[PDB]
């Protein structure tokens, strides 16, 4: 009972887009003993998960981004989300064999201090485990806290949701098209756009890539414009939709992933037409929340199991696959939610 | 009876910053009867408006050219074809660049007034559509707490002046921006703005709301826009609102800037609203019942600029583009 425990470990910051060298490999030795002091328990992690905000936690610390993310500190493991088994524990409403999805390192064994809106047990394994790091955990709660919450959204409104073959994304337009919303969405290969009009029910979408004039892609897909716009890429996407957006209509900015990587800000022009359309811009994290977790687990587990959701996810094999896994993500290599198994149970 | 009437007419459609030869005036004579139309009036106008808007309004709906301008102002019914109005009756609202005009009066275009015991020229900013702006833009759009950090943009503008106040007057620590010295002293010694600072000599701005703001910025009443938004998105505070009202340093620029620092509405979870005045018109009467005690006992103080006559009026349009003008640009057409 003193097991190795491999970690991966963020180098340094990174500047611009990350590539499987800003990563390394390190081997602990950790003992399977019961942890001590405040409330700890020891996990085995299973799986991980690659989500894009991880990128803001990479880059060098700015006083504005650390009011969400805090930095990864270099030459230590990469926090993350998680889904991992008890192995030990020192906390009350955890025993040996449970399971938890929360945050942790990315490796194998890890001591962790259990917090309400940080770590949540499973109590449902009628589901897929990994189902936990995409759909039933944060990704799945994002989509479901910023559209019913953030949008405020109204039967037969129109919806528009970029990025729409990522976890919130496929979740979101789902959620939306259970209200008779008009879902339209984008994705950067046709691949990814053929499944989210014909296997997530979409009711068109384009690749984003094949399309020069994206306030003319936009004005085909939406003719009578747009009343939400569910905000995950940013910048000439922002704008595009600005000018193609109706009146009263909502914004939820959830993410702004085409800005992550560029060191070099976008400039969004078009802000004036919110004036006059009377629009609604609203930041959300869910983090915030995380309070109605059990009321959306309640929600979505019901429609998983009756076939009203579906969802895709891309698994890459152990803790090795993880820096090529994460480093693909922000190109878009993967088609659904991107899993790491760490280990399988 | 049978006057000659002035109009200051737009000669044509505007690119960049207008001057003063944009604009020609005419004559057209008017008979002084009961009006011309269907449930008209025929207007005196007394006071007249230079609002910031109006720019828009001269790029190529918009105004015509050959046409007058059309704006903002305070009148007198001459004769009224209207069962609301008589002689003699005061009215604000949208009438044309004349001496005299032929309006339809409408509900929440054309308001009367009744409280006669304060300066007519307040019923063109304080007590007209910038005051209501202001009402309606920080109380409704902003969802003000005690205490909380304000900071109004153009804050010597009619609207910026009354925010800066109804912030002060609920216990938040407020401060303005304006662009010279002596817009930027009225602030504190008139208005008592917890401070400011000149936007043009301070080529610093993100840390120029840095040093007023050591706590950050809860309220944002954005009336300029551009690269003062991009200052307050970095000085935002948790929860942050912005509420969008106008972007006047946009108006006059053939090309619009752009805002890089928009991923902080994540992070600081802001809302930024966009809203416009007349969807709250019919919130008029509770502004002026809560708001003309205030005046009437000296606690909302008020700045205007006053240009005399029709004659002096292209100046001071074009002026107000320019920055000119020390308070609210009004333009007396014809005094009572």
Redesign the interface.
Same mark, same amino acid.
Request: charge should be positive; glycine fraction near 12%; include cysteine.
């Given at each position: 009972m003193t097991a190795t425990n491999k970690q991966v470990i963020l180098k340094d910051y990174v500047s611009g887009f990350p590539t499987e060298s800003d990563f390394d490999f390190t081997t602990t030795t950790v003992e399977l003993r019961v942890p001590e002091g405040t409330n700890s328990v020891l996990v085995k992690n299973l799986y991980l998960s690659c989500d894009p905000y991880m990128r803001i936690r990479m880059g060098k610390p700015d006083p $504005?981004?650390a #009011? =969400? #993310?805090q930095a990864y500190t270099p030459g230590q493991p990469i926090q993350g989300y998680g889904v991992s088994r008890i192995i030990e524990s020192g906390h009350p409403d955890y025993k040996k064999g449970d399971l938890l999805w929360g945050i942790v390192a990315w490796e194998e064994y890890s001591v962790i201090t259990p917090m309400t809106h940080a770590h949540f047990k499973i109590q449902h394994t009628d589901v897929p485990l990994s189902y936990y790091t995409g759909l039933l955990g944060m990704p799945g709660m994002t989509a479901y806290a910023g559209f019913y919450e953030v949008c405020s959204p109204k039967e037969g409104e129109t919806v528009y949701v970029s990025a729409a073959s990522g976890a919130v994304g496929q979740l979101v337009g789902q959620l939306a098209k259970m209200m008779g919303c008009y879902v339209v969405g984008s994705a950067g290969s046709k691949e990814k756009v053929d499944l989210l009009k014909t296997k997530f029910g979409f009711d068109d979408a384009f690749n984003y890539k094949e399309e020069s004039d994206l306030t003319a892609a936009l004005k085909r897909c939406f003719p009578n414009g747009i009343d939400i716009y569910f905000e995950n890429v940013?910048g000439k996407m =922002?704008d595009a939709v600005l000018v193609n957006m109706n009146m009263h209509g909502r914004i939820a900015?959830?993410?702004?992933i085409s !800005?992550y990587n560029l060191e070099n !800000?976008?400039? +969004?022009? *078009? =802000? $004036? *037409?919110?004036?006059?359309?009377? *629009?609604?811009? !609203?930041?959300? +994290?869910v983090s915030?929340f995380y309070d109605k977790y059990s009321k959306f687990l309640e929600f979505v587990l019901p429609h998983i199991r009756e076939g009203k959701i579906t969802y895709v996810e891309d698994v890459a094999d152990g803790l090795e696959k993880a820096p090529e896994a994460l480093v693909g993500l922000f190109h878009g290599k993967n088609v659904g939610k991107q899993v790491v198994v760490v280990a399988r149970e």
């Open positions: $504005s981004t #009011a =969400l #993310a940013g =922002l900015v959830c993410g702004m !800005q !800000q976008e400039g +969004v022009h *078009n =802000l $004036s *037409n919110i004036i006059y359309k009377r *629009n609604r811009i !609203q930041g959300f +994290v915030d």
